[PDB]
Amino acid sequence: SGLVKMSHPSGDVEACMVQVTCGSMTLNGLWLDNTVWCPRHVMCPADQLSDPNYDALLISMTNHSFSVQKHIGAPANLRVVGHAMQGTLLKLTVDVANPSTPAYTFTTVKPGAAFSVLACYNGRPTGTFTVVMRPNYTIKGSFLCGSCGSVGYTKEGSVINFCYMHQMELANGTHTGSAFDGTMYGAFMDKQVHQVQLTDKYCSVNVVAWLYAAILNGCAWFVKPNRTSVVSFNEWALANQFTEFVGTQSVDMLAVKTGVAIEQLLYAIQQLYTGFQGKQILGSTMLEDEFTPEDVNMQI
Amino acid sequence: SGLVKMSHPSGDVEACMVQVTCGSMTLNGLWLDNTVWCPRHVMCPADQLSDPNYDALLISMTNHSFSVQKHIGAPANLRVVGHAMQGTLLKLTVDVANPSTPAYTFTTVKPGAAFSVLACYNGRPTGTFTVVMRPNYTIKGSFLCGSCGSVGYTKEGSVINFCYMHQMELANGTHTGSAFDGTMYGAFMDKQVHQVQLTDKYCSVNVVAWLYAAILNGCAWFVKPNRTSVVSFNEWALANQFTEFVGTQSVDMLAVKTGVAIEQLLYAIQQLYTGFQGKQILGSTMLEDEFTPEDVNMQIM
């Protein structure tokens, strides 16, 4: 028992990190087979960090303009042999195939899904943490300058699902990247400028999962016969900043084991939104939406 | 910025996890050079949890009483050729050396310092998460049955500092283990007898760090002119389940960049124990002490 946030073991992903460097601009690269993905703002100097014609920067660039170096080991130097643009990413093709390429896939996440991040600086992994993809389409992480390109992923069996490559910071402590198809999550642009983000809804399903976890592992008190039909709750959610609760088998499993119905909870969450009191429940003091239903079962 | 919880990369340590088995008892061991470390309760059957004298159990063991499999690329089977017991750990010696043995040390961590745990199950890594060693010498982590043998570590530069091996759950949803000198964390004994506590205290130096990070993210209001000497505080700390703020760590540095005096926070913490206003500080209305000064530095240096 006990409920902490966990990232996946990073060994397999760590072996794919490299440092892409375009002149004086330098960031992080993902190396799989003999392709190196990295963010496209690496080819942007400083003066034009504003309104850059990327298609012009793309044709401007030539293979000799780039460099990439594996610091992990054994290194080291790979020859950039071909380049293309794929949305906000830049798809570098390289001399050698990564002998440590895992069984991998490229998938996008939805709000409320979780993935683990490998935070790298100059192609050197430094830390990992798990994050949830937000409703406004941002993540709350901790990344510093030169962290761009650092990746997010999940593991389905032996296959490592790659879902994120960090791009930039917006707001304070709030971040975005793109998916490996090139699409920035939530439209944002790969250039820092006025692009203020939509408001943050609370992940209602994840809260519900979190509250089931708390019913296990201890208490479990606010649970009363008072309930709120998922349909009346989802109407309330529109006004009060919660997501539209859907629910799943994974959630039913949590209901059945505890013996507490979904609704008895959906009610409760309405009362702790106001009553930020308890005093606490697990964590926390009130409302964690970072813990998915997938997670909560996985930790029993 | 943000301030999330970061375990170190697990790579190096994942390479060193194996499965150990004795009787039909099976747990996670750590393989370094020609040496495999695992909790000593593996060789207990189940009927001896009350008075397992391991002194007895270690003699009755032959090398050929233990199977040890790696499981992770590249597999797998390794052959024991030298057993031993050192405190609550088991020290095995095996026919082959780990070719992916990192640079490492054993170092006993102190309360309030943090480290990354690699959760294992049948010699298989499964999750990592950072955690803090509490005052009461427990860690409030997440394990299940089987994970025993799981290991906690702190990467110092190019070196791994092994500081934990997971041994049991104090039937609480909090956990303790051994260090890699044999010694248990807290003076506990590895047994099914019901065991005591040693209440928690808030890690003062860690709350202070957190409050700085709040200021670094623009959260201040709890700040005032007031102060309260370090020693003043430490006297009060005793009475209210807080640790002696030795702090006095080369940070500071957080005191230097914020221009907010360490003592000022000692006053604010004092009132925030009373309070809150209630405003919130980085999404909380209770003092958070699982973040070290170093975390706050690394995370915004």
Author numbering:
A (entry chain B): 1 to 300
B (entry chain A): 1 to 301
Q: Which sentences did the original study use to describe this structure?
A:
Similar to other CoVs, after entering the host cells, the nonstructural polyproteins (pp1a and pp1ab) of MERS-CoV are synthesized and then cleaved by two coronaviral proteases, a main protease (Mpro) (EC 3.4.22.69) and a papain-like protease (EC 3.4.22.46). The MERS-CoV Mpro, namely nsp5 of the pp1a proteins (residue 3248–3553), has been identified. Like other Mpro, there is a catalytic dyad that consists of a His residue and a Cys residue. Sequence alignment suggests that MERS-CoV Mpro, in a similar manner to other known Mpro, has a chymotrypsin-like architecture consisting of a catalytic core (domain I and II) and a helical domain III; sequence identities of CoV Mpro protein range from 50% to 80%.
In the present study we expressed and purified the MERS-CoV Mpro using the authentic N-terminus via an Escherichia coli system. The structure of the MERS-CoV Mpro was determined at 3.0 Å resolution by X-ray crystallography. The crystal packing belonged to space group C2221, with unit-cell parameters a = 87.2, b = 94.0, c = 155.1 Å and α = β = γ = 90°. The final atomic model containing two Mpro molecules in a crystallographic asymmetric unit agrees well with the crystallographic data and the expected values of geometric parameters. Based on the current structure, residue Val4 showed a hydrophobic contact with another protomer’s residue Gly141.
